[PDB]
Amino acid sequence: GFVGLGNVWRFPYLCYKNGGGAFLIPYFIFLFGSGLPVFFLEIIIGQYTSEGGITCWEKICPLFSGIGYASVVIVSLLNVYYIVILAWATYYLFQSFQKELPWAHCNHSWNTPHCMEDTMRKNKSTNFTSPVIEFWERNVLSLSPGIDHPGSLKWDLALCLLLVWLVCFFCIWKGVRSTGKVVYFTATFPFAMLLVLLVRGLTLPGAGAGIKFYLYPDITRLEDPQVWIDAGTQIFFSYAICLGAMTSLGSYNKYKYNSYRDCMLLGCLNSGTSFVSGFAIFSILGFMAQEQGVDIADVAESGPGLAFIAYPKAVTMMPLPTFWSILFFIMLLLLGLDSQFVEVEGQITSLVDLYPSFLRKGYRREIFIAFVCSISYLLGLTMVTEGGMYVFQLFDYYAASGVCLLWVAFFECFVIAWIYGGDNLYDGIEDMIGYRPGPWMKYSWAVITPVLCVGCFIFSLVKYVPLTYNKTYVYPNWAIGLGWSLALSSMLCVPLVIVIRLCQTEGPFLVRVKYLLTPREPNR
Amino acid sequence: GFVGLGNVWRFPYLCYKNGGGAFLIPYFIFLFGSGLPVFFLEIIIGQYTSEGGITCWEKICPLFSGIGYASVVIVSLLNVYYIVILAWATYYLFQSFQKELPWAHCNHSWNTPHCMEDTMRKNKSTNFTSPVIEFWERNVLSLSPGIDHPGSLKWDLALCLLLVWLVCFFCIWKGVRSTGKVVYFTATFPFAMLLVLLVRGLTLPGAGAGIKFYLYPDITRLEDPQVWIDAGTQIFFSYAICLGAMTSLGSYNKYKYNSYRDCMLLGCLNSGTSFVSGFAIFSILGFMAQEQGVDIADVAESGPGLAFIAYPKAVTMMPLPTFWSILFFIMLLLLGLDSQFVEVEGQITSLVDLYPSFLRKGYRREIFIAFVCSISYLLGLTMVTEGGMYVFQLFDYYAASGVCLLWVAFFECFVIAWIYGGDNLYDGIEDMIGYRPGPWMKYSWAVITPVLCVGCFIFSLVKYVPLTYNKTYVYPNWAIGLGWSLALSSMLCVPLVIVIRLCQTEGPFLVRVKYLLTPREPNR
Ligand SMILES: CC(C)CCC[C@@H](C)[C@H]1CC[C@H]2[C@@H]3CC=C4C[C@@H](O)CC[C@]4(C)[C@H]3CC[C@]12C
Ligand SMILES: CC(C)CCC[C@@H](C)[C@H]1CC[C@H]2[C@@H]3CC=C4C[C@@H](O)CC[C@]4(C)[C@H]3CC[C@]12C
Ligand SMILES: CC(C)CCC[C@@H](C)[C@H]1CC[C@H]2[C@@H]3CC=C4C[C@@H](O)CC[C@]4(C)[C@H]3CC[C@]12C
Ligand SMILES: CC(C)CCC[C@@H](C)[C@H]1CC[C@H]2[C@@H]3CC=C4C[C@@H](O)CC[C@]4(C)[C@H]3CC[C@]12C
Ligand SMILES: CCCCCCCCCCCC
Ligand SMILES: CCCCCCCCCCCC
Ligand SMILES: CCCCCCCCCC
Ligand SMILES: CCCCCCCCCC
Ligand SMILES: CCCCCCCC
Ligand SMILES: CCCCCCCC
């Protein structure tokens, strides 16, 4: 279940946004420096404590327990916008049940008269747009001029959003497993369809330029600090780390269990599939580039939904457009639904034991399931509006990416490396997994991750570039302040809990900090 | 370790030889009818008996125990020629240690003056040959006019053959594990390089025609019975079934072990990698087809070594030819060496307990290791000669493929389905794997496999077409008789043992057959 939408949507969009292969160098650097390190860190914390996200930190250190609450805020904010991605896929699937796909040609009402089939884009107001972009913006999104103009709500997406929310609600309400029936179909189908797209994508006449764009890096983009943050957060996003799910996932694992092999295996496949999937989508872009006579960096739309622009273009070029289009949206929806079933249930599982005596399992719990879904439905309803795409971009860049992931990832390593000690963790690890691992992990949590986290944070601050959508829309100042509020909401959690914890322990600050620094029953 | 030279070399050659996608329909039919069925059959026999190839049949049925000896003959004959494939790869690797690859251009001594670089083939004695083919036939094989002309021995291959034989001898002699050190590098590297070739192969300008050739079938070829036999034996070859290795492999498995999941998983990946690998090599052929202005069915050489013609052509188009060429031959040699380490040690392990009191572990055993390797070295030395390629084709088509695999596969199912009973096996299976499986297996061993095995055998006999090499060389009558002798050697083992055992049990034939039909201590 390592495959998610991030690997097929977030990764391609981020890599496309950040030049070409210039994304890869920070991507693999962050992978081998922190990603697998912090992934194993959370997994082994879960195994050592056999406890949940917030509470395992309490076991490791009563102070700096705000990391757990920060994770809850991130997962909550993530679910609010992650579901809207599934809403688009569901709408596309519904539109893929018609004989001729709507985006195959642009002669319908919503298409701007300046549209022209990609086949004639080069064959024949110099700026000519494509049907695939038109359907996504003038039909699926009804893009408004700006975030300051919300406009009329699009009920089509709202209904699709309600459906996916209801599917998620019932699955959690009825304790339905994340993978339905046999896990194989839920597993091999994403691989099969991805390989179907890859074979089609590579075979495309323009795939050569796309792969060269995909792999050959640009050192100039490395100077811009945004690529380092995005690559670092990409890994943080795809592995679903710093959200408390992996700590819960490691909880179920037995004390005597070789989680090291699982983490490095599941870690490399999750990134490996993303890298392979990057070949397919970027191969499409090269084909679109030469067919349209437009540069690869400008042939697609640099906003979330690159998976909704290049991949539906491939299914159009597939032997049976309708057949393949339906299957793609099925696997796309499948990769998102299973993620939601696990990540949504994580916070309620985190919330139910967070505030007991009121959320007892049963009547109190069942209404809470709808309560979480409904409030998050109204909040997720904002992205449905015509200008809700821009709000979505703020949620993607800030709520569960950007500085927020770096800050929490830093404190996860900062606590374990110094307050708890990387050497002290190995003593449990060799007891648990049976053998003491090498020095790659210890020198990553203590040095590589803290250096990478702060350096990206600091260089971001001095070289501050405001967030832009489609590299052409400048956000208003208030929206950036609103966007930072989501990030500040999660990051402020750690310091806030520290102050509360210190107050609880009346006494000299030094005595109080030392008292609560002591780990409390780390393992049983 | 499911990947072998069968998936990277045997499948491409067979598919290429038997038209295009017309190979696939019998391929998947035989897969789902017998391949996974007989694979699980041998695995579950090994698990139920926890005993070796010959002896497990004795447990199931003292009569029809010749299946074990037939497997020994097949594995022995297979090892004699399988090693010569590694000898070619080793020679290619040695030739890949030079700055410029020898087959990149044809201006050397061995190249016929009628050769012309593929780049100039279409750009410019109408039949013009290519350097890649020239290097393989002239420098690597020194192809003689016919099998009736052996000619001078090529010492280069003989030395390479001795080296791989010595590597195999020492690994078995020192009990070295099949996978050296960490299994990961022995495992992920074949996948990585295969995916490197696939990305390069698909990106090639002519990959479109090759995939269409690969997938779109021809019903006319289905009439020819040779495609059904080759597809059936391809599955039998790639899974290394009907050789007694899987029976030994299933022996190590615990009685309470879900081998069903392992078999269907390892079964589908082994065929899945072969199918994916077929895309890469056939993509190359389409690129060679359009660059040479020659049909895909005639652009390569229809003899064993298609992996030595298309794949080295691919690395000549990769960014670092020498770098990738060395890596390819490394993974090619890796896919063969590990197979030899396991399949060679299988027969000595089968021979040592077959004739005890003389092959005791130690001084008697160690000289036997060289004795098996040396005799098989002299026998494998025949394919090294200039005309030894044709002898190799006889070994490929007859010794461990063709009718020989069908006959033994038939009797494996014929014994279990009728003499032992498919229902009786399930009673153990539900006790072992914990749950009774479906009716797909039982109706395959009793109906699908026996119908497929005999039907291919019968239609082969009535529509007899003599074996040909490169679709242009007609073998002499004596060579076919020699070739059938290898096949008749293995198949005749079954009836021979039956007569010997019937003699052992003096009495009425009906009483004797019934007495030895009774299973003897099937499980402990
Ligand atoms: C899945 C992992 C192993 C990555 C896939 C392969 C990696 C190693 C990359 C590195 C360099 C790459 C090559 C670099 C340049 C080109 C030229 C282009 O016109 C076709 C693709 C091709 C030939 C690339 C194929 C893939 C490649 C070999
Ligand atoms: C909307 C923006 C401002 C985000 C606001 C986040 C609020 C709702 C969150 C973030 C940090 C949270 C606090 C952090 C720590 C604790 C200590 C615990 O023992 C009781 C709850 C308490 C006191 C939390 C209450 C709720 C809280 C204040
Ligand atoms: C690995 C398994 C799933 C097989 C790989 C994909 C299978 C399902 C096959 C079946 C039909 C195939 C397509 C049939 C025809 C063509 C046209 C050709 O010009 C490019 C490849 C393309 C577009 C094929 C891509 C691969 C394909 C989709
Ligand atoms: C070179 C060609 C003709 C192949 C010859 C194969 C010979 C060497 C093999 C094939 C079948 C074998 C026989 C089959 C069965 C048994 C019964 C066993 O209890 C003693 C060995 C004995 C009697 C085998 C002796 C060797 C044998 C005759
Ligand atoms: C000028 C009006 C702009 C309205 C923007 C609404 C943004 C909603 C954000 C919701 C965050 C939870
Ligand atoms: C006319 C001479 C032809 C010689 C052919 C030799 C074939 C050797 C076969 C070895 C089988 C074990
Ligand atoms: C081109 C005809 C397509 C008809 C609908 C197919 C739906 C398949 C769902 C698995
Ligand atoms: C010989 C010059 C090209 C580099 C070859 C490197 C081969 C590495 C094999 C592991
Ligand atoms: C300028 C502020 C407009 C409304 C912002 C609402 C944020 C939840
Ligand atoms: C016509 C027979 C030539 C020699 C055959 C040798 C077979 C081992």
**Touching check for A285 and chain B: CB below 8 Å?**
no
Closest by CA to B412, choosing from B72, B60, B79, B73, is B60
- Which residues of B are less than 8 Å from A182 in CB distance? none
CA–centroid distance for B228 within its chain = 16
Whole-angstrom distance, CA of residue A325 vs CA of residue A329? 6
Closest C-alpha residue for ligand 1 atom 27: B196
> Nearest chain B Cα to A284, which residue?
B203
**CA distance between the termini of chain A:** 29
Please report which ligand is nearest the Cα atom of B99: 8
Q: In the structure encoding, which two tokens stand for residue A434, read together?
A: 């049976």
Q: Are B300 and B310 in contact (CB under 8 A)?
A: yes
Q: Do B199 and A195 touch (CB under 8 A)?
A: no
Locate the chain B residue with the closest alpha carbon to A196: B276
Structural element, H or E, at residue B469: strand B468-469
Q: Which domains are present in chain B?
A: 5-517 (1.20.1740)
The tokens describing A143, both together, are 């893009």
Kind of pairing between the strands at B468-469 and B473-474: antiparallel
- Burial of B146 from C-beta contacts in 10 A (0-12 / 13-18 / 19+): middle
Residue A199 one-letter amino acid: V
Closest CA to A44 of A254, A250, A255, A262: A250
Distance (Å, whole) CA B340 – CA B159 = 18
B280 vs A327: CA distance, rounded Å: 24
Q: Quick check: B272 contacting A, CB < 8 Å?
A: no
Q: A297 — phi, psi (to 5°)?
A: -70, -15
Return all residues near A248 (Cβ < 8 A) that are at least 6 apart: A46, A52, A53, A346, A349, A350
Cβ–Cβ under 8 Å, residues B91 and B142: no
DSSP state of A32: I
* Nearest CB to B199 within list A195, A202, A205: A202
Strand-pair partners of A129: A115
CA-CA distances (angstroms) from residue B390 to A100, A322, B144, B146, B477?
55, 50, 9, 7, 14
d(CA A203, CA A208): 9
Report H helices in B296-401. 296-299, 311-315, 321-354, 363-380, 388-394
- Chain B's closest residue to A286, CA to CA, is B203
Q: At which residue do the structure tokens 């017309």 appear?
A: B22
Residue A280 makes CB contacts below 8 A (sequence gap 6+) with A194, A197, A198, A200, A201, A202, A314
d(CA B371, CA A411): 65
Report d(CA A401, CA A398) in Å as an integer: 5
User: How many H-runs (helices) and E-runs (strands) does chain A carry?
Assistant: 27, 2
Q: Which residue of A has its CA nearest to B184?
A: A265
**Helices (H), ranges, B174-258:** 183-203, 207-215, 219-223, 225-238, 245-252
Dump strand ranges (E) for A183-301. Answer: none
- CA torsion through residues A187, A190, A192, A195, sign: negative
Q: Is the CB of B489 under 6 A from ligand 4?
A: yes
Task: Report the alpha-carbon distance of residue A57 to residue A498 in Å, rounded.
Answer: 12
**How far is C-alpha B425 from the chain's CA centre?**
29
CA A139 from chain centre, in angstroms, equals: 25
Q: How far apart are CA B89 and CA B332, in angstroms?
A: 7
Using the structure block, give the residue that is written with the tokens 């597993």: A187
CA distance A35 to A444: 10
Which three-class secondary structure state does DSSP give residue B13?
Answer: helix
As given in the structure block, the two tokens for residue A328 are 């793609």
List the one residue out of A132, A122, A130, A129 whose CA is nearest residue A101. A132
CB B84 within 8 A of CB B380: yes
Provide the token pair at A91: 């709408």
Backbone angles phi, psi at B465, to 5 degrees: -120, 120
Q: Which chain B residue lies closest to A184 (C-alpha atoms)? A: B265
Alpha carbon dihedral B237, B240, B243, B249, in 10-degree steps, equals: -170
By CB neighbour count within 10 A (0-12 exposed, 13-18 middle, 19+ buried), where does B352 fall?
Answer: middle
Q: How far apart are CA A368 and CA A358, in angstroms?
A: 10
Q: Does B183 touch chain A (CB under 8 A)?
A: no
Secondary structure of residue B473 in the 3-state scheme: strand
Structure letter (DSSP) for residue B2: -
Does any CB of chain A come closer than 8 Å to the CB of residue B196?
no
Residues 6+ apart with CB under 8 A from A408: A67, A70, A71, A74, A242, A490, A491, A494
Closest ligand to residue B477's CA: 10
Please judge whether B211 and A202 are an interchain contact, meaning their C-beta atoms are less than 8 angstroms apart: no
Please indicate if any CB of chain B lies within 8 Å of the CB of A208: yes
Per-residue burial over A427-458, b = 16 or more CB atoms within 10 Å of its CB, e = otherwise: ebbeebbeeeeeeebbebbbebbbebbeebbe
Q: How far is CA A514 from the centre of its chain?
A: 37
Q: Which atom belonging to ligand 1 lies closest to the Cα atom of B195?
A: 1
A475 phi and psi angles, rounded to 5 deg: -75, 150
User: Ligand 8: does its nearest atom lie under 6 Å from the Cβ of B318?
Assistant: no
Please give the Cα distance from A37 to A42 (Å, whole number).
9
Put simply, the answer to whether A207 touches B211 (Cβ < 8 Å) is: no
Q: What CA–CA distance (Å, rounded) separates B441 from B260?
A: 11
CA distance A428 to B80: 52
Residues of chain B with Cβ-Cβ distance to A203 below 8 Å are 202, 207-208, 211, 283
The resolution, in angstroms to one decimal, equals 3.5
Interface of B with A in 440-469 (CB under 8 A): none
CA distances B217 to B7, B19, B32, B37, Å, are 20, 8, 18, 25
Does the C-beta of A326 come closer than 6 Å to ligand 9? Answer: no
- Ligand 1 contact via A280 beta carbon (within 6 Å): no
- The one-letter amino acid code at A161 reads L
Asked if residue B143 lies in contact with residue B392, where contact means CB atoms within 8 angstroms, the answer is no
Helix (H) or strand (E) holding B508: none
The two tokens of residue A510 are 């030094």
- Cβ count within 10 A of residue B36: 24
| Full DSSP string of B236-257 | HHHTTTTSSHHHHHHHHS-SS-
Distances (CA, A) of A378 to A154, A230, A465: 14, 29, 31
Q: What pairs with residue A225 in β-bridges?
A: none
Torsion sign across C-alpha atoms A426, A427, A430, A432: negative
Q: Which residue has the tokens 């078999």?
A: B263
Who's near B148: CB < 8 A, 6+ residues apart? Answer: B387, B476, B479
Instruction: Identify all chain B residues contacting A283, using CB atoms and an 8 Å cutoff.
Output: 203
| For ligand 1, mutation pick of B283, B311, B318 (most atoms within 8 Å of CB) | B318
| Cβ partners under 8 Å of residue B128, min gap 6 | B114, B115, B116, B121
The CA–CA distances, whole Å, from B514 to A482, B54, B57, B508 equal 87, 20, 16, 10
Q: What is the CA radius of gyration of chain B?
A: 23
d(CA A504, CA B468): 89
Give residues with Cβ within 8 angstroms of A78, minimum separation 6: A243, A343, A399, A400
**Ligand 10 closest atom vs CA B478:** 1
Exposure of A297 by Cβ count < 10 A (0-12 exposed, 13-18 middle, 19+ buried)? middle
By residue count, chain B amounts to 524
Cα of A300 from ligand 1 centre, angstroms: 22
Single-letter code of the amino acid located at A400: A
Q: Is A324 on the interface with B (CB under 8 A)?
A: no
Return the DSSP state at A175.
T
DSSP-assigned letter for residue A474: E
Strand partners, A385: A153
Strand partners, A468: A474
Q: Which amino acid is at B388?
A: G
Scan for tokens 């499409």, then name that residue. Answer: A284
Pocket (CB within 6 angstroms of ligand 2): A 69, 489, 493, 496-497, 500
Would an 8 Å CB–CB cutoff place A199 in contact with chain B? yes
Size of interface A-B (CB pairs under 8 A): 23
Q: Is the CB of B399 under 6 A from ligand 6?
A: no
Distance CA(B466)–CA(B160), nearest Å, equals 32
Closest partner residue to B203 (CB to CB) among A195, A207, A276 is A207
Beta bridge partners of B115: B129
Phi, psi of A441 (to 5 degrees): -70, -45
Residue with tokens 């059959």: B41
Burial environment of residue A464 by CB neighbours within 10 A (0 to 12, 13 to 18, 19 or more) = exposed
What is the distance between the alpha carbons of residues A426 and A152, in angstroms, rounded to a whole number?
A: 57
Q: Nearest CA to CA, how far is B324 from chain A (Å)?
A: 17
User: A319 to chain B: nearest residue by CA?
Assistant: B212
Which residues does a gap of C–N over 2.5 Å follow in chain A? Answer: 124
